[PDB]
Every structure is written in C-alpha cells, then in structure tokens.
Amino acid sequence: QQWFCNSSDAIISYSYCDHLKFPISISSEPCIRLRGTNGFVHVEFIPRGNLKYLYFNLFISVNSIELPKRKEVLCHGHDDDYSFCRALKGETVNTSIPFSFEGILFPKGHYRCVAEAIAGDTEEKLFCLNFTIIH
Amino acid sequence: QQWFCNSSDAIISYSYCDHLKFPISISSEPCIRLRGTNGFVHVEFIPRGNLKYLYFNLFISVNSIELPKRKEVLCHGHDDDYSFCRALKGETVNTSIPFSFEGILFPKGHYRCVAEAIAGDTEEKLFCLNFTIIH
Amino acid sequence: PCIEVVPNITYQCMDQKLSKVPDDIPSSTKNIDLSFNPLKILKSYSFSNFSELQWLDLSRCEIETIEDKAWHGLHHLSNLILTGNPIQSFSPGSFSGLTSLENLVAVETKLASLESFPIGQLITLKKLNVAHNFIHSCKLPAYFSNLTNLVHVDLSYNYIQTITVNDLQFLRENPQVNLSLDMSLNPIDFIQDQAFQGIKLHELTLRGNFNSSNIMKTCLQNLAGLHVHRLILGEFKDERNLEIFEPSIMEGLCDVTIDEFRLTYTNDFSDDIVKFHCLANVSAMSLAGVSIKYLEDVPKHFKWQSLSIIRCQLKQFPTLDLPFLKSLTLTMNKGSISFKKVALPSLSYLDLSRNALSFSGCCSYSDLGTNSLRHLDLSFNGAIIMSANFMGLEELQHLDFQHSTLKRVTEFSAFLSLEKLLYLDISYTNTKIDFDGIFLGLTSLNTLKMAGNSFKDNTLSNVFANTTNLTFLDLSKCQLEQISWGVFDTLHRLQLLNMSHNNLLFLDSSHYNQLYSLSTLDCSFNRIETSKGILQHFPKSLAFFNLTNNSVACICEHQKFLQWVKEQKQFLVNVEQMTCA
Amino acid sequence: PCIEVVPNITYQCMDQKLSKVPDDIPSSTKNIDLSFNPLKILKSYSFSNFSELQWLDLSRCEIETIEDKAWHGLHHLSNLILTGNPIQSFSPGSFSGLTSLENLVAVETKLASLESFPIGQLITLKKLNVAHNFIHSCKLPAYFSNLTNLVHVDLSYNYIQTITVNDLQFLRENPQVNLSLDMSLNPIDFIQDQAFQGIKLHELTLRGNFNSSNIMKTCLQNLAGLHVHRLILGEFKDERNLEIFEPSIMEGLCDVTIDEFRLTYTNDFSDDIVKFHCLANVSAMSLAGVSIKYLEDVPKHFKWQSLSIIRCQLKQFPTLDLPFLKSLTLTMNKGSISFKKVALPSLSYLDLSRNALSFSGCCSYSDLGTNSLRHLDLSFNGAIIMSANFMGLEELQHLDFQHSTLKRVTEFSAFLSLEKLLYLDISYTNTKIDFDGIFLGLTSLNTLKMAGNSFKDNTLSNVFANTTNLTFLDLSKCQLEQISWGVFDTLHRLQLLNMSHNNLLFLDSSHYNQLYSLSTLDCSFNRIETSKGILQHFPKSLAFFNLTNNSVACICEHQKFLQWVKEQKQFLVNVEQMTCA
Ligand SMILES: *[C@@H]1O[C@H](CO)[C@@H](O[C@@H]2O[C@H](CO)[C@@H](O)[C@H](O)[C@H]2NC(C)=O)[C@H](O)[C@H]1NC(C)=O
Ligand SMILES: *[C@@H]1O[C@H](CO)[C@@H](O[C@@H]2O[C@H](CO)[C@@H](O)[C@H](O)[C@H]2NC(C)=O)[C@H](O)[C@H]1NC(C)=O
Ligand SMILES: *[C@@H]1O[C@H](CO)[C@@H](O)[C@H](O)[C@H]1NC(C)=O
Numbered sequence A, B: 001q002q003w004f005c006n007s008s009d010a011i012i013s014y015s016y017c018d019h020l021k022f023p024i025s026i027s028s029e030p031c032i033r034l035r036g037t038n039g040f041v042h043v044e045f046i047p048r049g050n051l052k053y054l055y056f057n058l059f060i061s062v063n064s065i066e067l068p069k070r071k072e073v074l075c076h077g078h079d080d081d082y083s084f085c086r087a088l089k090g091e092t093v094n095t096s097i098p099f100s101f102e103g104i105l106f107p108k109g110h111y112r113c114v115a116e117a118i119a120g121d122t123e124e125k126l127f128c129l130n131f132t133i134i135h
Numbered sequence C, D: 001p002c003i004e005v006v007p008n009i010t011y012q013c014m015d016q017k018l019s020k021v022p023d024d025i026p027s028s029t030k031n032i033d034l035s036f037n038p039l040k041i042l043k044s045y046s047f048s049n050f051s052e053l054q055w056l057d058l059s060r061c062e063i064e065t066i067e068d069k070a071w072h073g074l075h076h077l078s079n080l081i082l083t084g085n086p087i088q089s090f091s092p093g094s095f096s097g098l099t100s101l102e103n104l105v106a107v108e109t110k111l112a113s114l115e116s117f118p119i120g121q122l123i124t125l126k127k128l129n130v131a132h133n134f135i136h137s138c139k140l141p142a143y144f145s146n147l148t149n150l151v152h153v154d155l156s157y158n159y160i161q162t163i164t165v166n167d168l169q170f171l172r173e174n175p176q177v178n179l180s181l182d183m184s185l186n187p188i189d190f191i192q193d194q195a196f197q198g199i200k201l202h203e204l205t206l207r208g209n210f211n212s213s214n215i216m217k218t219c220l221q222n223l224a225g226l227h228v229h230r231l232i233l234g235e236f237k238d239e240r241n242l243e244i245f246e247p248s249i250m251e252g253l254c255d256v257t258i259d260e261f262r263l264t265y266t267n268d269f270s271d272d273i274v275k276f277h278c279l280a281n282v283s284a285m286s287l288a289g290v291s292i293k294y295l296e297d298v299p300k301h302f303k304w305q306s307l308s309i310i311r312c313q314l315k316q317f318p319t320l321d322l323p324f325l326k327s328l329t330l331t332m333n334k335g336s337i338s339f340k341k342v343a344l345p346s347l348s349y350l351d352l353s354r355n356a357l358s359f360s361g362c363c364s365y366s367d368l369g370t371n372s373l374r375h376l377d378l379s380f381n382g383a384i385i386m387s388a389n390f391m392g393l394e395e396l397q398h399l400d401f402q403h404s405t406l407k408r409v410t411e412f413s414a415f416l417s418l419e420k421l422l423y424l425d426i427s428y429t430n431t432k433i434d435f436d437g438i439f440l441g442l443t444s445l446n447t448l449k450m451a452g453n454s455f456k457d458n459t460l461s462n463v464f465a466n467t468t469n470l471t472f473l474d475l476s477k478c479q480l481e482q483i484s485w486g487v488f489d490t491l492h493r494l495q496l497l498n499m500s501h502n503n504l505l506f507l508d509s510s511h512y513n514q515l516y517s518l519s520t521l522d523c524s525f526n527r528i529e530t531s532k533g534i535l536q537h538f539p540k541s542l543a544f545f546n547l548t549n550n551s552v553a554c555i556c557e558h559q560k561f562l563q564w565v566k567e568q569k570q571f572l573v574n575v576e577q578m579t580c581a
C-alpha cells in the first residue's frame, strides 16, 4: 500500500497495522537482497513519543509458521549511536540509517512481519507496520 | 584403621570399606595439608582386576551433609599418563604418584569419604577405602 | 472527550481533533497532555481555572501565536513542553504568570535568538531546551545572571558555527555558576583563540560537530583553558562523519582539565586512542559503541578510577594493571570474549554482564588482584565454570549470575567465603540442586533469587537451614512437586516467598508456620488442589497470598479449607476471580 | 565354593583357598577364573574334564611348577592367563595340549629368555604377553617361524638394554610378518647401527625407556631404515622422566618412514616439537596428555591427514590451514577455549567434544573452510550461539550437540541447509521449542534425540511435518503435558518413540495411527491414567509398549483400555508386573 521494492531474491512491501496507523514514510536503498545487502534505510516522520528508549517488537511468520516475538533495541538511553534517539515527541525526524548484513539461508516463501515501535520509557506504541516479504 | 597422618590443618586416616576388603597399602608423603600440598602418593598392592580403565567413585560427607557421588577417572584406556594403568590382574604394583594442588576453602570439621576403585571394562569393584578427615 | 488515565489528575488528549482547551472536561487535574491537536492559536487566560497544574505538554499543537498573558494562573507549573509549534517570535511577557517553572522545552519553535527570548524573569528555571531551532549564535545573554538556578542549556541541532571569547563572557565573570552545555549537531568550524580561558563547565557535549578532521583538530586546540567535569565527544552513525580519526586530533585536550571523559561512536577508530597521554589524569574513562578491538597497552601512571566499555567490539578481554581503578564495567560486547586474569588492587566494583563471556576457574583473588571487590555482576553470559569458592573475595555484597550457564556449583560449597554477601542471583543458570550444603557460608544473605532451575527428585531440600538472614526468596519456575519437612523453619525474617509456576499439588500450613515475618506468599500457577495442616497457623503477618491460576477442588472433604478461603479472603488476592476445577 | 555367573558356562573360583581345581564343576564350562588361590603346582591331567574350556585365569596362584601334560584335554582354550606365578622355568612340554591357544599371558613369571620359552608349537598364537619378567635380550627366536599367526608381542618392563642387527634378523628374513611390539619400560641404551635396516613393524611402542636426552637422540638415530605404521613415543608421570626435551632429539626419525605418530605424556614439552620437520610426511599425528599450550606453527607442506589432540592443555584454539587434513579431533582439553576460524579444505571429520568449548557464530563455511564435512560433534561443551544455519556445510550427515548450551536455535531454521543429515542429537541443551519450523530442511533425518528440553506451554507441537525419513525419535524428559493433533501423521517410517519421564496425564490413540512402522513406544514414568480415542488405531507393528511406572486409576469407567491387555499381551512389556494406583 505504502511502498514496494524488488531485488534479485526478494520482493518487499508494507502497509500500516490495521488498528494502528500513525504516519511514517520509510524506505531502503537499495531494495533488500536477503542473501546480502549494504545500504541506507531512509526514514521521515514525526514520532508520537520520545525516542530516547526506542525498540521494536517483531512478529514474524514464514508461510504461516510463526516465530517467537523478536525484541530489537535501537536506542538504549546512554550515548546512543543514532541521531534520532535524541528526538522528542512532536519533533520532525529525517535521517538515513546505514545497514549491512551477510545473509543467512531463508526458507523460500511468504513472510509476514508486523513491526511495532515502542517508546521504552512509557511503553506506548509509537507506530506499527505490516510487512510482506516474498523470497 | 590401616593408616593415619597428621598435617598442620588435617588429620587423615583410612580403614577398609565394611563389605569389600581387598588389600592395598596406600600412603602420602608428606601428609596432605588441605590448604595446598606438593608430594607423592605411595601405592603398593596387587590388583584383583586389570587397571586399564581404573576410575573411582567417591562418596563424600561434610558433617553428615553428603555430596553427589563424584567420579574420578585415572586411566582412560588409551595412551594413559601413569605406568600402573597397564598393570594386569595379579601383577605387583609398586609406584609413587606425584600430586599437587593449591587448596579451596573447606569447612569445618568431620569428613567421611568412601573411595571405590573400579575396573571400567568389567565394572568390578577392585578395592574400597573408608577415609576420615578432620580439618 | 479526552482519554482519562487517572481520575482527576492526568488526561490524554492526543490526536483528539480539539481546537481549544477542553472546557467541559473536569477542572481538577495536575497533569495534562494536549499534544497533536490543531489548536492553531493559544488564547489568553486559557488556563485560569486550572491552577493545580504541574505538567503541561503542547507538542505539535500548530500554535503560531502565544497571546499576551496566556499563562494566567499557572503558578504551580514546573514542566511546559512546546515542541514543534511554529511560534517563531515571543513577545515580552510571554511567560509572565509562570512563577515556579523548572523545565522549559522549546524544541523546533523557529526560535531565532536567545537575546530576545523573554525568559529573563523566570528565576526558578533549571533546564532549557532549545534544540532544532534557528539559533546562529552561541551567545550567552546577560539575563542569565538573573537565572540563578540554571544548570542545563541544550543548543543541539542549531546553526552555530563559531564560538568567541565574548560569547562565553557570562561564565568568565560568573565562576560560581554550575552550567552544562549540549552543543551537538552544530556545524562548528571556528573557535576563537582563548575563548575557553577562565571558564568552568559541568558537562559539555560535542557530538557530530566537525566535517573535517583538521577543523576538529584546531577547534579542540582552542578549548584550551576549559575546566570540564564531563566531556562527551564523538559522532552518530546516521550522520556526517570523519574519514580518518588520528589520536593527534586530540592534542588540544592536554590543555583542558577533564575529570571525566566520554567517547561515543566513531566511523574510524584506532585502538591506541585510549593510550593517548592527554587523557592520563582523567578520573572516569568511558567508551560506548566504539570500534575498539584490543585494550592492552595502558600505562601504569594513568589515573583512571573508573573505566566503562559499553557496546564495543573487543576481540580479547582487556589486559589491565591499573593500580587506582575502582570500578570497571565491560558490557554488551559484540563477540564472545573469554575471561582473562587481571591485576586491579583498588577494584571494588565489577560489571561484566551481557558479553557471552566464558569463565573457566571462577573465582578467587588471583583472577582479579583485589581484596576490595563489593559488587560482581556476571549475568547474561556463557559458561562459567566454578572452580574456587571465592578465596580472597569475602567483601562481596552483591553477586549476579542470572541467565549464565554456571557449572559445578553443586560439586562443593561454591560460596563458602562469602560471609558478607547480601544479594545473590542464580536465576536461569541451569542449576540442579543436588547438595544441601550448596549455600553454606551465606549467613548475611538477604535476597536469594534462584528462579528457573530445578531440584533433585523435584523436591525442595534443606538448603536454607543457615541462610537465616533471608528476607526475599524467589523459587519460581523450579519444576517443584514436593517440599521436604522443615525447609523454611529457620527463616524467621523472610518477608517474601515466591513459589509460583511450579507443580505443587497442594499446600501444607506447617511449612510456613515459623515464617513470623512473611507478608507475601506467591503460589500462583501451580496445581494447588487444597491446603492441609492447621490453617490458622499460616503467618499472621500475611497480607498478599497469591493462589490464582491453580486447580482448587470444590469437594466436601476440603471444607475446612474452603471455609478458610472465605474468612481469610481479605488477604487472598483476586479471591473473587477464583474458580473451581 | 565357586560363584556361578552363567549356568554350565561361567564360574568364579577367585579368592577361596583352593589347592586344586574343584571337581564338582560342570563339564560344559567355557570360562573359569581360579585366580588368587594357593595351587602351588599344576599336576598332570588337572583340566581333563573341561574339554570345552575357552578362557582360563590362573593369576596369582603361587605356581612354581607346571608339570608335563597339565593342559592335556584343553583343545579349545584360546586364552591362558598365568600372571604373577613364579614359574621361573618352563619345561619343554609345558604347553602341550593347547592346540587352539591364541592369547598367552605370562606376565611376571620370572621368565628370563624367549629362546627357552617352549612355545614353538603354539602355531595358533596371536598375542604373546611377557611383560614384567627378566628378559635381557631383544632377540626374536627362530621358532617364530612356526608362529605364523602372531601379531603382537609385549616385551614391556623387562631388562632389555640393546637392540642388535642379529636381534631382528627373523623380521629381516621375513618381510611378510605383520608384527607389533611393545618395548616400553625397558632400559634401552644402545641400538646397533643398521639394526633397523630391512625391517617392518605394524606398531612399535617406546614409552618410558630413556633417562638421558643424549641416549634417546642416539637410539632414535639407529632406528634408521624402519618402516612403522604406528610409532608411539613418550613417558610416564610416575616414572624417571627426561630433564629436557628438544625437537632435535627427534632427529633420526627423518630416516624412518612413519604412517602414524603418537606422542604421549612428556615431562618437558615444547610447542615446536610437533612442528618438527622430520614429522612432515606422517599421515596421522596424535597428542595425548601433552602439555601443549598453543598450536600455531604448522607449515602448509605438511602432509597430515588426521590430527588428534586428546586430554591436552591448549590455552587457545589452534590456528590451522593444512590442505590435506581430512580429520580433526580435539577433545577433553583443559579449561575452556573459544572456537576460532580454521581453513581446512579437505576436512570431512570434526570432533570437538568434551572441551567446555565456546562457539560464537555457529556455524558455516567461513568457520571451517571446507565443503565436505560429514561429521560434526560439538557435544559436552559450553555456550554455542547459533548465528548461521550451516551454509556451505550441506554434506553434513552427523551432528551432535548433546549436553552443550545451544542459544538462539529457536530464533530461525538453524538446520535449514542440512538436506543430507542422518543423525541429530540436541539432547540436554536447554532448548525451549517454540517455533514450528525448527526442523525445516531435515528431509533426510533418520535419528532425532532431543531428550531433556521443553516446549512452549508444555505441549508437543507440529515440528515433524517435514522429517519424513525418521526411524528413531527421543522425547523423554521434555516436561510434556500435552500432544497436538496431527503431530506424528507424517512419520510413516518411525520405528522407535521414547516419550518416557514426562508429565502426560493420559494417552490418545489417534496420535499413533499413521505410525505404521512403530515397533517400540515408551510412555513410562508419566502420570498416565488411561488411554482414549479408539484402540484399533494403535499400530499393527507395535511389539514393545512401555506403560510401567505410571498412575493408572483402576476402576470400570475406563474399562475399554483395561481390556486391551489380553490379546495384546506379548506386545506390552512387563505386563504381569504392572500395578494400579
Ligand atoms: C513471582 O514470580 C513470577 C515470575 O516467575 C512473577 O510473575 C510475573 O508476574 C507479572 C504480574 O505482576 C506478570 O505480568 C509476568 O508475566 C510474570 N513474569 C513471568 C511469568 O516471567 C511474579 O510477579 C512474582 N511474584 C512476586 C510477588 O513478585
Ligand atoms: C526412553 O528414554 C529413556 C530416557 O529417559 C530411557 O530410560 C533409560 O532406561 C535404561 C534401561 O534401558 C535405564 O538404565 C536408565 O535408568 C534410563 N536412562 C536414563 C538416562 O534415565 C529408555 O531406555 C528409553 N526407551 C528406549 C527403548 O530406549
Ligand atoms: C616347529 O614347531 C614344531 C612343532 O613340534 C617343532 O618340531 C619345530 O622345531 C618348530 N620349528 C622351529 C624352527 O623351532
């Protein structure tokens, strides 16, 4: 609905979570080769909470076989790596986050991944994204 | 009681186990100081089984509080470190075994340790010594 | 209508399409968050009736104008948040009324200058946040001399490019001021010679400022004269970064006196930057998110009293011989280093959590070289092989192994030397308690956390007979099915006992009859069918007795118990949601 | 007065006070131990009645004299044990009657020479043990010409001081002989020049022979010309040891052709003595009980095909990149060590068990540098953090993690690339199964041992849908309380299912329909009351059903199941021993 990209081994797309729809424009350059990618994740938005303690709950399914909740932290609260960690509720966020990975072997098929963004200090949901991956 | 020595921190003695009395003269030079000792264990006997796979079951008690059975392997059956490992049933064994250790904190008063020597190939009990340590 | 989280104190008004201050909603609250509403213009006297108010949040409220005297009767307020309102200019008397304000956040308000910013009257002010605005000058205005409680000013992400001596004159003539300055994300490319002569700062944060290492180098040289308690330097991963990061960029630092030094992420990093001589007199050294791979060539004359390595990339456990090091933290390391012997005679605080560390032959004096250790944290690591029972470490008060893989801990009395230990956590260490003497020596211990382990024959054994000072005991998720008689008889001071998420088929009064101090007993998520023994013998001090999520047996042979449930229901928690099985 | 161990077959007459072979003992007996009895003498025709005797133990029977025809009737005896009897002199005719003897043990029989030892007609002899005697000569007697089946002679712990050219003439004149020779614990001080020219040995053991480094150098020099399949060298902790051990002592082994080289305990080891140039062409290298601290030397030209390192003391994982190494063993090492990347193109067999090994980033091609790994044992180790699912290692056919701590194994499909795997053991790894796709990719798997783990909510879930070729599955001690519906439907080939020592309240017959090939089902030590779900569905192939040590409620309300015992009687195990509860 929001974004779409294609790679040699994956097609990637997302929409907002059905019952949580706070705006975020997010994009990766290049599109993700699951076997191995280097690039930037572009993110533009106005967060609804302080990013000081930002982390993600990730809910993954592979062909309807679901993974345990994967908790991934981005801002720990002390000398964080990223510019956005310091952003407050209401403040505009516009940045390019680099990334790299060497690539595991993934079952071919249909992946679902809802990505909930949490402000770890208040436990409030900031935004939620519903990802579709075809590998 | 078959033997005893006094040390600066322990008095050690042994007798034969109640229901297994195959003879062994075992002694140490010097007497073991639980806080650390360098020396030799003098052993002179004629084993009632092959020594190729000799291990020990140790049943230890501290003021009537018992430890889980401890198993000490001495001969693994292959390129072993001690000459006596190759001694057959009925053969004269007369050897002195170096030992060394620094010393952990031990409680307190009264130790019981029954030591069962076992030929690992047949699971036959070879000899059994009832040790008493006052620390 | 607004979402009310707290009855007559706190109100959530987010994205509620409000264009005004809610009049028909209760005038009683202390905290109100009004963010993300299209207010457009903030009328005057809008907050007349609210006078019990302490905290007010107006983030991204589309506010273009702050009308004269808008903060009418707000004199208890201490926190005002104005983030993302395009108000641009504040006319004199903007904050008149706010006579107790501690915290002012004006982030992204198109603030162009501090000079004309009408906060001269607010003597109570503590923290000023003007990040993400259009301030081009670093100038500290004279009205700051009126602001005699000011301790932190945030000027992050503005357009400040220069710092002059005159910019900092305020501090020069006012040595008694304790001020801290975050100047991150400013494109600073020139600092006047001697700008920092005769100025004290508490903390100075300079992250992601310089584009060239040369501009960085020369700027640091003109820090000369500065007295900083804490200096924080570095970059961000998602920003402009320096290509090459030589320690020679850091040469201006030996002409600044630094108590505490913090380095954060850097694109390039040379291991021997920690060896750099201009950092020798620092009392606290910190590196966080740094690409350090080794730490072994540290001079003995270095004065470091604490050293903190957080989220770095060590390939080997640092070799350390620092004689005045009191506190060492190494945590969240990328790899899986294994413990290596160290020599730190001043060390009393050691935190080695979250590194997937392996430790063979834990633990005694010869591993650390100190007799002063009071805190040892080895939680969230790999295999830890117990081999020595803490000889030489009997000052230990706090010891944490939670979630690590302890070995051989039941092979002897692994804690025997720890007669001063107050806190012990061995939860989720995969320990199977096989030995009644496992806790011998632990006579000072207050807190025993041991969740997620197991016992021989799923029976709770007499392991607590001499842990007499226990006030907190967690035995949850221990696969328990039975409790030996007499197990708790010694625990006269125990206050909380958690045995939830086991497999107990019933309770017995007599296990608890000597727990004269017990206030909380948690047996939820077992399979409790009833309790036996003299029911009136449960501790009289009991207040919270959790029995939810069990399988109570509503049969006529458990009547004394079922009767007892009703009389003692004040103390049973969620009794009214309890259902028969 | 003898103990009967196997009726009419095996009898234990040890340690009575017998002066003679007891005559009430069965005629058919195959095995008799008569050691530690005072027999003094073996009268002619003593063992006449025992025509089928195969094994005879006479150790420590105080025998001074063997008379002619003592063994007359014993045509079937293959083993004769005479250890510790002071039979100083053996008459010609001592061994007559032993037509099938294969193993002669005459340890510590005060024997002085092999020339006079009357065994020239023991044509069937495979093993000759004459350790701990008074043998002074190394001379292989000419009657060895009759001994065409002999493979091992043990000359250990004797008085042999020299080896001469004439000593080994028999072997020189007979290149076809496949002989092994234990020469340990002899005080050898000289080997004649050219003594070992034209000689071939299968195994030569030389442990504990030398007191002086100079003597060992000069003795190994005159080993020139020898072809050995396996040379075993080293000393003992409880014996006279070498003062210094230099690589240069090994000089001499350059003129010997060695297939396999074994180094045992050495008092004064140096790391470079296994790097020695005269070992380059060996095809198997072995260290056992050796104080090696580091292995980071090994030149690439070295032709080693197997390296085996057992009970050694490595402080670091050895850096290795040998082009030819097909087989690496590192086991029972001291302390902990953390895995380090190696580069082994030919590597097909890797055993890294029992080391308290740490392994961060298991496991892929870049860890090992091979594509042909068929066997990987990582059992009895420390924390093994799964980071990679075996990309590049798809030939893998045997994988063992037993008793190690696996981490992150449920965070993805950790075995996905292992389409060829036959055997997988993850027993006792503290894995909590909470991802249905944990065994994805294991479509060739035959054996799955996962005892001692757990499942989310203690319910057995749909993890076996893709493991079609499973014949063996072990789920004991998994704390199971429940079984999901179609969990076994796919396992058409399954022969054995151990589900013992769980917490199953009852069985359900529908779970095991589709298990058409199930011979053994083991449900012992559960809390099983009864079985439900139509008893016809239990497999027709079901030969052994274990319902022992359960809690069956004996009444009439589940009388259907209690009726299945009759016709299915030979199929249940310990049928007539089961008790109600
Ligand atoms: C007793 O121990 C258990 C953990 O084993 C605690 O359980 C947690 O309780 C909270 C409710 O306050 C739940 O939301 C969590 O899910 C539970 N944690 C788990 C299952 O890990 C319990 O709170 C402890 N009791 C006391 C009095 O502290
Ligand atoms: C089912 O698995 C269990 C493991 O829990 C096995 O139980 C063992 O049985 C042997 C006898 O064969 C006993 O000596 C041991 O006490 C048990 N071992 C352990 C480690 O507890 C049982 O053998 C399995 N069934 C089959 C057919 O293999
Ligand atoms: C061969 O063994 C026979 C059997 O009696 C004996 O006569 C002969 O001397 C033996 N050969 C040698 C070389 O001893």
Ligand SMILES: *[C@@H]1O[C@H](CO)[C@@H](O)[C@H](O)[C@H]1NC(C)=O
Pocket: D151, D152, D178, D179, D180, D202
């Ligand atoms: C020689 O004998 C040994 C037994 O020690 C045997 O293992 C080996 O295979 C034999 N070699 C040949 C070629 O028969």
